[model samples]
Target: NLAPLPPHVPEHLVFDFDMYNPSNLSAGVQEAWAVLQESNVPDLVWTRCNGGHWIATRGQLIREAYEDYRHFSSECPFIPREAGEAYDFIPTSMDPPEQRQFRALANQVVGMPVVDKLENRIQELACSLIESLRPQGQCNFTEDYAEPFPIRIFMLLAGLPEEDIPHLKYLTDQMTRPDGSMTFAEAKEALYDYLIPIIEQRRQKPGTDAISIVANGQVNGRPITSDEAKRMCGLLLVGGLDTVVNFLSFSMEFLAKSPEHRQELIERPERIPAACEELLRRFSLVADGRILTSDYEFHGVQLKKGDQILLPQMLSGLDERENAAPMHVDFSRQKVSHTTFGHGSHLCLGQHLARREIIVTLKEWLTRIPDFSIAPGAQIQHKSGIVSGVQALPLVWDPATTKAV
Candidate 1:
């Protein structure tokens, strides 16, 4: 255990947890942050990591920071100024008025109506993916089930070819989990190059695919420009590829370990939806926040303008002061409001699809591999990012007891 933080910053909080390549994340991520809570560090403090910005550790401060967009601007949302500046995607990095139009286009593509059309296809894909692995008795759930299921579904939605997944997945991976081969700016530009041609092609003649709808569609009763369409499409690629891919892995891994939870879903499948919500809140794996535009005071600490703040959309409820037994996973909890999908004007447009993908996975997976566990003698691994995820989830089940739905 570490010593009590000094008095000048009584409850002197330090968010030294690295959003990228955090150590010992395998055991549990929230447990890593639990060090701060257990240390009784106060409400807010400066962290040396990621260019040394102030951290809002509690739910109230984090919520205020996210809501008061004037003080806490989402324009440069990433932690390091370099990372923030490199973020050029539309809507996500753009402020309101301009941001709203693109989000509307994005909503048209992934919203509830679109999802209703894709529901059967999503259900079919989930069953097909699981059936292929059922006979093996053991498989890497992350690659076999989690990653491809969502990526392929996204490809279908975007009207992209299956062959292109590898290239786009690699680029998307680097944007969040950088490999030093390309700066975030360089990677983003490369993505734009790919989107430009697609937009141009769709502009010349439209089709039923999601890309054509956005590319040729109108905003404010005027045809959207190639540049606007390209940026909006870029956000869709990142959202589709990143969020569900990482989240599915986390959800399956949690279910694999908790048999009691798994059986609850297996018996009463209707609860799968609620179970997904609870898991998202409990894990809260993604950490997202914005930059401070001007000097401000939060809980007594003076934070200079231009400083970065990591609101960690995931960790707030875990604080004992915020939720009772914050670590416990309670599927039956009446209300589970979390920043997991996000909050405010920037709430996830693709949330309906993401939830559908999760619901289908829980339903199909439990029906097939109702009883499973961590592969014998193998150590599960996790890596962090804008989306932290299981590097590999080797799961084993008895074939005789379970079969694909």
Candidate 2:
């Protein structure tokens, strides 16, 4: 199931890599993608996999493409073409002057102020969840903690019922990691269908919830339309539900395997923030692309109009060019640079909230359950898609080792 190489694409520069299912995937997602930066690979290579596209194998090219939005448009950001065409999330799909206003409103909802206001809830939830699991001695970390902690907080913020999570999360997952159950357009439509009624209700009687804020919110000095509210709110739901939920699993899985790393964090609690940054770099897991607006020559390579190049936010941090011994996780690394949240104007809006959630979980979990390990002989599996995820993370510890704080 591969597309033929275009005549203009030289065979020498082609590196038929598949983002969804890398050959080296068993090694781990980050390690699998790192093959692109091997000594033999060029900075930019054309992959005949996934309908043929270019991949920016280093941080420099990835950052440049994101900054030069004029040439590399965000109009069609996903692979498999159809999904990109169906992607209509506001602010993300819109570029420049038009995108700026909606982002401002999004910031008001997930910005530092919103995170500061929710700090207590974030802390309380982490403690409560960890405390409940502490005495259990064994738990599926992914389901028990990673999924619920951030998701429940987001549901509270959006004024959505906790019971609705399964349906809403399924739609969101289909968009990011489709299981052939639906197309991206179908998923987008499903999400919008769910939000349409909520938008209507909030418009008639706005509440302090995030949905109400966007429903009654203003853009460029004019109130946003119902369609606009639904689109914007749909994006917010995707961000709140997906980003941190998967990231927490990757971080905790690493902690379970690396006792030395856990000891470092426990001995020096103040370094949790720095540790979080380092972990983000190591486990950075997002990959999205930009569609070419016109024919252009980039780095001596010719790209045709309509070409889609995947600028993986995950690769930047892992590239040895950006960090020494790139794969190694060093909390005290002099400089931990990455585009995990993204780069340029489209930088992720909920990063502050994500960081806070990460830091609080690390500190609180380690303090209470200082020792834990992956369940014996259970190999953790990862699924790759728009967002890479852990299939399951089974962790076990002694109840006597964990103390309620």
TM-score, predicted candidate 1 vs. hidden true structure: 0.93
Taking the tens digit of each residue's C-alpha lDDT, what string does model 2 give over 32-53?
Answer: 8899999999999999888899
Regions of candidate 1 where Cα sits further than 4 Å from its true position = 1-15
Clashing pairs in 1: 11-42
Would you give me the overall lDDT of model 2?
0.92
Alpha-carbon runs more than 4 Å astray in model 2: none
C-alpha TM-score for every candidate: 0.93, 0.99
- Candidate 1, residues 1-405, lDDT tens digits: the string is 222443333333565656675555767766665555665566676666666666677777777778788888888887666878777677888777778888888778888999999999999999998988887899888778888999999999989998998889888887787777988887788889988988898895858788998898888779998888887888789888888898888788888889999989888988989998888788777677788788887766766677788887776677766678888898897767677777777878888998999999999988988899999888777777777777888999899978744
The TM-score measured for candidate 2 stands at 0.99
Judged by whole-model lDDT over C-alpha atoms, candidate 1 comes out at 0.80
The CA lDDT of each predicted structure is 0.80, 0.92
